[PDB]
Protein backbone atom coordinates (compact mmCIF):
# COMPACT_ATOMS: atom_id res chain seq x y z
CA UNK A 1 0.00 0.00 0.00
CA UNK A 2 1.07 3.66 -0.05
CA UNK A 3 3.92 5.38 1.56
CA UNK A 4 6.85 7.23 1.96
CA UNK A 5 9.57 4.93 -0.08
CA UNK A 6 11.47 4.21 -2.86
CA UNK A 7 9.24 1.67 -3.72
CA UNK A 8 5.52 3.41 -2.52
CA UNK A 9 6.78 7.20 -2.39
CA UNK A 10 4.83 10.11 -3.88
CA UNK A 11 6.07 9.44 -6.89
CA UNK A 12 3.89 6.23 -7.24
CA UNK A 13 0.70 7.01 -5.88
CA UNK A 14 -0.28 8.24 -9.24
CA UNK A 15 -0.61 4.07 -10.47
CA UNK A 16 -3.55 4.16 -8.00
CA UNK A 17 -4.88 7.68 -7.43
CA UNK A 18 -4.56 9.08 -10.62
CA UNK A 19 -5.58 12.71 -9.79
CA UNK A 20 -2.00 12.50 -8.33
CA UNK A 21 -1.44 14.20 -11.73
CA UNK A 22 -4.63 16.44 -11.33
CA UNK A 23 -5.38 20.22 -11.68
CA UNK A 24 -5.20 21.61 -8.25
CA UNK A 25 -2.85 19.18 -6.32
CA UNK A 26 -0.96 19.81 -3.27
CA UNK A 27 1.27 20.85 -1.87
CA UNK A 28 2.66 23.58 -3.61
CA UNK A 29 5.83 26.23 -3.81
CA UNK A 30 4.86 29.60 -2.46
CA UNK A 31 6.39 32.11 -4.48
CA UNK A 32 6.22 35.07 -2.23
CA UNK A 33 7.19 37.94 -4.81
CA UNK A 34 4.29 36.19 -7.41
CA UNK A 35 1.58 35.76 -4.65
CA UNK A 36 -0.46 38.92 -4.45
CA UNK A 37 -2.42 40.75 -1.81
CA UNK A 38 -6.13 40.73 -2.25
CA UNK A 39 -7.07 43.12 -0.13
CA UNK A 40 -10.68 41.10 -0.52
CA UNK A 41 -9.41 38.49 1.79
CA UNK A 42 -11.03 38.83 5.58
CA UNK A 43 -9.15 38.09 8.80
CA UNK A 44 -9.12 34.23 9.59
CA UNK A 45 -11.57 33.43 12.46
CA UNK A 46 -9.88 30.83 14.50
CA UNK A 47 -12.46 29.56 17.64
CA UNK A 48 -10.89 26.53 18.94
CA UNK A 49 -11.77 27.56 22.91
CA UNK A 50 -14.61 24.74 23.28
CA UNK A 51 -12.64 22.01 21.06
CA UNK A 52 -12.30 18.60 22.84
CA UNK A 53 -9.50 16.40 21.50
CA UNK A 54 -10.14 12.80 21.90
CA UNK A 55 -7.54 10.59 21.18
CA UNK A 56 -3.88 10.03 19.26
CA UNK A 57 -3.88 7.48 16.71
CA UNK A 58 -0.47 6.74 14.88
CA UNK A 59 -1.69 5.90 11.40
CA UNK A 60 1.51 4.45 9.84
CA UNK A 61 2.18 7.50 7.95
CA UNK A 62 2.06 10.24 10.71
CA UNK A 63 0.04 10.64 13.66
CA UNK A 64 -3.62 12.15 13.86
CA UNK A 65 -4.72 14.13 17.13
CA UNK A 66 -8.75 13.62 16.78
CA UNK A 67 -11.37 15.91 17.74
CA UNK A 68 -15.37 15.58 18.51
CA UNK A 69 -16.74 17.11 15.57
CA UNK A 70 -20.10 15.98 16.52
CA UNK A 71 -20.87 19.98 17.22
CA UNK A 72 -19.93 23.43 16.00
CA UNK A 73 -16.96 23.48 19.02
CA UNK A 74 -13.51 24.35 17.24
CA UNK A 75 -14.46 25.68 14.01
CA UNK A 76 -12.37 28.28 11.14
CA UNK A 77 -14.30 30.70 9.27
CA UNK A 78 -13.17 33.78 7.48
CA UNK A 79 -10.45 34.58 5.36
CA UNK A 80 -10.99 33.31 2.41
CA UNK A 81 -13.56 31.08 3.76
CA UNK A 82 -17.39 30.94 2.83
CA UNK A 83 -19.53 29.44 5.78
CA UNK A 84 -18.33 27.15 8.98
CA UNK A 85 -15.55 24.75 9.19
CA UNK A 86 -14.96 21.72 11.93
CA UNK A 87 -12.16 20.94 13.03
CA UNK A 88 -11.45 17.05 12.66
CA UNK A 89 -7.83 16.61 13.21
CA UNK A 90 -4.33 17.81 12.86
CA UNK A 91 -1.01 16.09 12.22
CA UNK A 92 2.17 16.60 11.18
CA UNK A 93 4.73 15.79 8.28
CA UNK A 94 8.42 16.14 9.21
CA UNK A 95 11.87 15.33 7.90
CA UNK A 96 14.56 13.15 8.93
CA UNK A 97 16.65 16.56 9.56
CA UNK A 98 15.90 19.73 10.07
CA UNK A 99 16.39 20.95 6.72
CA UNK A 100 13.40 19.36 5.32
CA UNK A 101 9.83 17.91 6.41
CA UNK A 102 7.64 20.50 5.38
CA UNK A 103 5.21 20.11 2.23
CA UNK A 104 4.88 23.36 1.37
CA UNK A 105 8.03 25.46 0.66
CA UNK A 106 8.30 29.45 0.54
CA UNK A 107 10.53 30.65 -1.92
CA UNK A 108 12.20 26.85 -2.44
CA UNK A 109 12.71 27.25 1.07
CA UNK A 110 11.66 23.65 3.46
CA UNK A 111 10.63 24.21 6.87
CA UNK A 112 11.36 20.97 9.48
CA UNK A 113 8.08 20.12 9.66
CA UNK A 114 4.61 21.24 8.67
CA UNK A 115 1.17 21.28 11.10
CA UNK A 116 -2.52 20.44 8.92
CA UNK A 117 -5.61 21.43 11.12
CA UNK A 118 -8.10 19.62 8.87
CA UNK A 119 -11.45 20.69 8.83
CA UNK A 120 -14.52 20.39 7.15
CA UNK A 121 -17.54 22.55 5.57
CA UNK A 122 -20.42 21.57 7.65
CA UNK A 123 -23.15 22.23 4.56
CA UNK A 124 -22.09 18.72 3.55
CA UNK A 125 -22.92 17.60 7.08
CA UNK A 126 -20.48 15.20 7.19
CA UNK A 127 -16.17 14.74 6.74
CA UNK A 128 -16.65 12.14 4.10
CA UNK A 129 -19.13 13.66 1.96
CA UNK A 130 -17.40 17.25 2.67
CA UNK A 131 -14.11 15.80 0.45
CA UNK A 132 -16.40 14.75 -2.63
CA UNK A 133 -16.70 18.76 -2.90
CA UNK A 134 -14.54 21.34 -4.07
CA UNK A 135 -14.81 23.30 -1.15
CA UNK A 136 -15.46 20.42 1.53
CA UNK A 137 -12.33 21.33 3.52
CA UNK A 138 -9.99 24.02 4.96
CA UNK A 139 -6.88 23.15 5.66
CA UNK A 140 -4.74 25.18 7.98
CA UNK A 141 -0.54 25.05 7.73
CA UNK A 142 1.71 26.08 9.97
CA UNK A 143 5.32 25.93 9.45
CA UNK A 144 8.00 24.67 12.10
CA UNK A 145 11.26 25.38 12.65
CA UNK A 146 13.85 23.83 14.91
CA UNK A 147 14.65 26.97 17.61
CA UNK A 148 12.65 27.06 21.53
CA UNK A 149 10.57 24.75 22.30
CA UNK A 150 6.67 24.93 21.67
CA UNK A 151 5.65 24.69 25.33
CA UNK A 152 1.70 23.46 23.70
CA UNK A 153 3.47 21.04 22.07
CA UNK A 154 5.31 19.21 25.08
CA UNK A 155 1.91 17.25 25.75
CA UNK A 156 1.81 15.47 22.23
CA UNK A 157 5.42 15.16 22.32
CA UNK A 158 5.09 13.07 25.89
CA UNK A 159 2.66 10.69 24.44
CA UNK A 160 4.34 9.57 21.35
CA UNK A 161 5.89 6.57 22.80
CA UNK A 162 3.01 5.00 23.81
CA UNK A 163 1.76 5.10 19.60
CA UNK A 164 5.34 3.84 18.47
CA UNK A 165 3.45 1.98 15.98
CA UNK A 166 0.78 1.80 13.28
CA UNK A 167 -2.27 1.10 14.28
CA UNK A 168 -1.56 2.64 18.17
CA UNK A 169 -3.87 4.80 19.95
CA UNK A 170 -4.14 6.61 23.13
CA UNK A 171 -6.58 8.79 24.60
CA UNK A 172 -6.18 12.24 24.65
CA UNK A 173 -7.96 14.55 25.82
CA UNK A 174 -7.84 18.48 27.04
CA UNK A 175 -5.61 19.18 24.66
CA UNK A 176 -5.64 22.93 23.22
CA UNK A 177 -4.82 23.57 19.74
CA UNK A 178 -4.32 26.98 20.58
CA UNK A 179 -1.37 26.41 21.69
CA UNK A 180 0.09 25.26 18.39
CA UNK A 181 -0.18 28.57 16.48
CA UNK A 182 2.20 31.33 15.49
CA UNK A 183 1.30 34.60 17.26
CA UNK A 184 0.16 36.38 13.72
CA UNK A 185 -2.70 34.89 11.49
CA UNK A 186 -0.92 36.87 7.82
CA UNK A 187 -2.01 33.69 5.72
CA UNK A 188 -1.04 32.63 1.66
CA UNK A 189 -4.40 30.90 0.08
CA UNK A 190 -4.72 28.79 -3.06
CA UNK A 191 -6.91 25.81 -3.65
CA UNK A 192 -5.94 22.79 -3.78
CA UNK A 193 -6.09 18.65 -2.35
CA UNK A 194 -5.28 16.99 0.61
CA UNK A 195 -1.30 16.24 0.66
CA UNK A 196 -2.24 12.39 1.50
CA UNK A 197 -3.92 9.48 -1.05
CA UNK A 198 -6.55 10.03 -2.10
CA UNK A 199 -5.52 13.07 -2.91
CA UNK A 200 -9.24 14.80 -3.51
CA UNK A 201 -9.31 17.79 -4.87
CA UNK A 202 -11.88 19.31 -1.74
CA UNK A 203 -9.21 21.84 -0.03
CA UNK A 204 -9.11 25.42 0.73
CA UNK A 205 -5.34 25.94 1.87
CA UNK A 206 -4.67 28.49 4.09
CA UNK A 207 -0.21 28.51 5.11
CA UNK A 208 0.08 30.74 8.03
CA UNK A 209 3.35 32.66 6.94
CA UNK A 210 4.63 32.79 10.43
CA UNK A 211 6.37 29.92 11.47
CA UNK A 212 6.16 28.31 14.84
CA UNK A 213 9.36 27.23 16.86
CA UNK A 214 10.09 23.68 18.34
CA UNK A 215 12.96 22.19 20.06
CA UNK A 216 15.51 20.25 18.26
CA UNK A 217 14.06 17.54 21.43
CA UNK A 218 10.48 17.73 20.32
CA UNK A 219 11.13 17.15 16.93
CA UNK A 220 13.60 14.17 17.40
CA UNK A 221 10.84 12.68 19.45
CA UNK A 222 8.58 12.50 16.44
CA UNK A 223 11.36 10.97 14.55
CA UNK A 224 11.57 8.08 16.64
CA UNK A 225 8.00 6.46 15.93
CA UNK A 226 7.61 3.76 13.49
CA UNK A 227 6.05 3.44 9.86
CA UNK A 228 5.38 -0.54 11.19
CA UNK A 229 3.19 -1.81 13.02
CA UNK A 230 4.34 -4.07 16.23
CA UNK A 231 7.03 -6.40 16.22
CA UNK A 232 7.61 -5.65 12.72
CA UNK A 233 11.47 -4.66 11.11
CA UNK A 234 11.79 -1.19 12.46
CA UNK A 235 11.46 1.54 9.69
CA UNK A 236 11.54 5.11 11.69
CA UNK A 237 8.63 7.50 10.72
CA UNK A 238 10.71 10.41 8.80
CA UNK A 239 10.38 11.95 5.56
CA UNK A 240 6.72 11.70 5.94
CA UNK A 241 6.12 14.66 2.49
CA UNK A 242 4.76 14.86 0.07
CA UNK A 243 6.92 17.32 -2.62
CA UNK A 244 6.20 20.62 -4.33
CA UNK A 245 3.67 19.69 -6.77
CA UNK A 246 2.92 22.02 -10.07
CA UNK A 247 0.90 25.17 -9.58
CA UNK A 248 -0.84 24.91 -12.94
CA UNK A 249 -3.52 27.39 -13.28
CA UNK A 250 -3.50 28.51 -9.60
CA UNK A 251 -3.20 31.67 -7.90
CA UNK A 252 -1.89 32.11 -4.12
CA UNK A 253 -3.33 35.18 -2.69
CA UNK A 254 -1.91 36.64 0.15
CA UNK A 255 -4.05 38.09 2.95
CA UNK A 256 -1.43 40.91 3.86
CA UNK A 257 0.91 43.35 2.38
Not at 55 to 64: E, M, T, V
Not at 149 to 169: C, F, H, N, R, Y
Not at 199 to 207: G, P, Y
Amino acid sequence: HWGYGKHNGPEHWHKDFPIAKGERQSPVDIDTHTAKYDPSLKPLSVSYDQATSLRILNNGHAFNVEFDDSQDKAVLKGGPLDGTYRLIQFHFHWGSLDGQGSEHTVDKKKYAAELHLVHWNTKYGDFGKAVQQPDGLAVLGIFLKVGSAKPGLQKVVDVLDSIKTKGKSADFTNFDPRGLLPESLDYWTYPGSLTTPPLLECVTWIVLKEPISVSSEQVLKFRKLNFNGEGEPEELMVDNWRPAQPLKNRQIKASFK
